[PDB]
Chain A
Amino acid sequence: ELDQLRQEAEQLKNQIRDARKACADATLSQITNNIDPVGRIQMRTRRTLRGHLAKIYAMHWGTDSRLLVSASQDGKLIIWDSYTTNKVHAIPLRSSWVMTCAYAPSGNYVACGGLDNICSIYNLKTREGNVRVSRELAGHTGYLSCCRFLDDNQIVTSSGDTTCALWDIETGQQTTTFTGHTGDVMSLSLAPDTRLFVSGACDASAKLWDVREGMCRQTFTGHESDINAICFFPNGNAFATGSDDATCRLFDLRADQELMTYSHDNIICGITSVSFSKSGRLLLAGYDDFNCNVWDALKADRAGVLAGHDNRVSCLGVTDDGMAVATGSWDSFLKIWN
């Protein structure tokens, strides 16, 4: 019955919470209190990428740490060259309202999507030089919030219909649909071993999935508002979530609970983007107060600000070699920090 199952579920839900407390023998701050602090970090702007005439909602680095893609409401993606600021490509888009862009590891395809509900995979290299839609991937009911390639044949996308779908590009059809969320899945991050991925939604839940099995292995509930960003730790056994409550939290899988909470009294605005560094020592986080913050992933110590944007930072990214950090705001600018 509805109440009979609820009694079984409520006791089970209490069991998981109770069993989760049979493991917290110590806290992250206590175990890591006696280490050398990072100290002040003074990273400066090295390049500014002008060219966008509207708000910027996404960017993504390539796997060579040299080429990056940037989406904007002007209706065009731009594949920049961060070393020399040239504009390698400029792809016009059918729909101006785009929320996500992605760059394939092979460097051959670039994806995008937004309120048009369609995922648009573009081909970078072909005959005649022009860049045209390789395939449009529809089937979703809500707005495409995040896209991440797995290979040149697989893409994983999360939308506002509370579901994430895995696609075969050649077929153009969904292979696995991941249900289990009750809200808009606005972020997802891929494990380095491309076998697991996490997703954060407006239900204040960070769910970990299985790319092959299609099931939801764990469910992390420690936040209090909508999770706007999520990113895997470089080891692949932890992730950081940034909600609107001005708090970043570092979770873990083998412990299956929260280990740290990064928050300060002065910062009251939401958290837009979060990513880690190559060593997993620094947690970068974007905010609505127009500046980035550099946190300590092991001491929860605020350690720096990248303040150069007139409007809110909407995206952030760390190169695959730990060489640079790119920041994009609604003021139509990308600043390559270092």
Chain B
Amino acid sequence: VSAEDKAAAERSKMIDKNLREDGEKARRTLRLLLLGADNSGKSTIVKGIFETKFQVDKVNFHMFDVGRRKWIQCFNDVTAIIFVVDSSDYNRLQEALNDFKSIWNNRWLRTISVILFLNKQDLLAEKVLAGKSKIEDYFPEFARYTTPEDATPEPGEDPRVTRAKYFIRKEFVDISTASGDGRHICYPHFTCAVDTENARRIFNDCKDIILQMNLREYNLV
């Protein structure tokens, strides 16, 4: 080798050091992705690219929104996708299910789990109890649906609205259980626009995602 070549060799080696050191900081931060229609409370949960940073239980979280036809290929290596849906506007609920069907069934999101936030459930309680709008006018199957007695974890919570919540969630989980093959799982949650506990919920779900990701690495699941 010559004299400048060894100086070019050292320039490469130093760049290798910064490349490998910067990668370590990336492995300690979990990347997410926010999705949802307008007036879905998308930007008011944890409180083109518009990044968001926060940490819960000393683990860094990085949350992204775009403002999905074909640029979604870029987010193939995200820890999870955060789908946010209005649970009060029964007019456009079906367009939310159709939105969720494409994300779940997309080719490039086969191994990406989804955290589903059923936002604005405070309006949902007010709407169904007010006795003006009826869900059956938008989903005929509602009149023949019974609240599953297996789960009733809603304390201090009205019974009529309870039937509506377990029906909105059912219409989103049947899609997840339709064609998932156990590669990715859906985690549903019911949130208001005042709940400060949403950062915890992502942490617990992103812990199960990584736990499953580690189990599949060891051929256990």
Does a CB–CB distance below 8 Å link A and B in the complex?
yes
Whether a CB of chain A sits under 8 angstroms from the CB of B8 is: yes
Judging by beta carbons under 8 Å apart, are A86 and B8 in contact?
yes
B69 touches A202 (CB 8 A): yes
Report the Cα distance A51→B26, complex, angstroms. Answer: 15
| Interface bin, chain B | 20 to 34
> In chain A between 20 and 69, which residues have their CB closer than 8 angstroms to a CB of chain B?
51, 53-55, 57
Q: Is B130 an interface residue, CB under 8 A from the partner?
A: no
B23 and A184 within 8 A (CB) = no
Nearest residue (CB) in B for A118 is B48
Q: A53-B26, A74-B26, A184-B69 are in contact. Are A99 and B15 (CB under 8 A)?
A: no
> Cβ of B11 and Cβ of A87 under 8 Å apart?
yes
Contact (A97, B74) CB under 8 Å given A184-B69, A202-B69: yes
Per-position contact with A for B19-57: 1 when CB-CB < 8 Å, else 0? 100110010000000000000000000001100000000
Interface residue from A51, A99, A115 paired with B16 (Cβ < 8 Å): A51
Which residues, 71 to 87 on A, are CB-close (under 8 Å) to B?
Answer: 73-74, 76, 78, 81, 84-87
- Chain A 163-207, CB-CB to B under 8 Å as 1, else 0, gives 000000000000000000000101000000000000000100000
> Is A88's beta carbon under 8 Å from chain B?
yes
In the complex, chain B residues whose CB is within 8 Å of the CB of A85 = 12
A300 to chain B, nearest CB (A): 28
Of B9, B23, B70, the contact of A53 (CB 8 Å cutoff): B23
The minimal Cβ–Cβ distance linking B15 to chain A, given in whole angstroms, is: 4
A54 contact set on B, CB distance < 8 A: 26, 77
Nearest CB of B to A160, in Å: 7
Give every chain A residue within 8 A of B16 (Cβ-Cβ). 51, 87
Decide if B76 is an interface residue (CB 8 Å cutoff): yes
Cβ–Cβ contact B19 & A51, under 8 A:
yes
B18 interface residue per 8 A CB criterion:
yes
* With A86-B9, A87-B15 as contacts: A115 and B26 at CB distance below 8 Å: no
Given A53-B23, A95-B49, A143-B48, A86 and B11 contact (CB-CB distance below 8 Å): yes
Q: Which residues of A contact B74 (CB under 8 A)?
A: 57, 73, 97, 99, 114-115
A115 to B74, CA, bound (A): 9
CB neighbours (8 Å) of B211 from chain A are none
Contact B15 A115 (CB under 8 A): no
Task: Report whether over half of chain B's contact residues are helix, strand or loop; otherwise say mixed.
Answer: helix
Chain B, residue nearest A160 (CB): B71
- A90 and B20 alpha carbons, distance in the complex (Å): 12
* Contact between chains at A55 and B71 (CB < 8 Å): no
B23 contacts A74, C-beta separation under 8 Å: yes
A146 to chain B, nearest CB (A): 14
Q: Which of A76, A99, A115, A186 has the most CB of B within 10 A?
A: A115
Task: Give B74's nearest chain A residue, CB to CB.
Answer: A97
| A258 interface contact, C-beta 8 A | no
Q: Tell me, in angstroms, the Cα distance from A117 to B50 when the chains sit together.
A: 12
CA distance A55 to B75 in the complex (A): 10
How far does the alpha carbon of A54 sit from the alpha carbon of B59 in the complex, in Å?
Answer: 21
State the CA gap A37–B20 with chains docked (Å). Answer: 47
Q: Is B77 within 8 A of A55, CB to CB?
A: yes
Q: Is there contact, CB below 8 Å, between B23 and A226?
A: no
Rounded to whole angstroms, the CA-CA distance of A86 and B22 in the bound complex is 19
- Nearest opposing residue in chain B for A80, CB measure: B12
Asked if residues B76 and A55 are in contact (CB atoms below 8 Å), the reply is yes
Q: CB distance A115 to B48 under 8 Å? A: yes
A97 and B26 in contact, given A202-B69, A226-B70 (Cβ under 8 angstroms): no
**B66 CB within 8 Å of chain A:** yes
A116 within 8 A of B: yes
- How close is A123's CB to chain B, nearest CB, in angstroms? 18
Question: In the complex, what residue of chain A is closest to B18 when comparing beta carbons?
Answer: A90
Other A-B pairs beyond A116-B49, A160-B71, 7, CB < 8 Å: A53-B26, A54-B26, A74-B26, A86-B12, A115-B48, A115-B71, A184-B69
Binding site for A on B (CB under 8 A): 5, 8-9, 11-12, 15-16, 18-19, 22-23, 26, 48-49, 66, 69-71, 74, 76-77
Could you pull out 5 A-B pairs where Cβ atoms are within 8 angstroms?
A87-B11, A99-B74, A114-B74, A202-B70, A330-B76
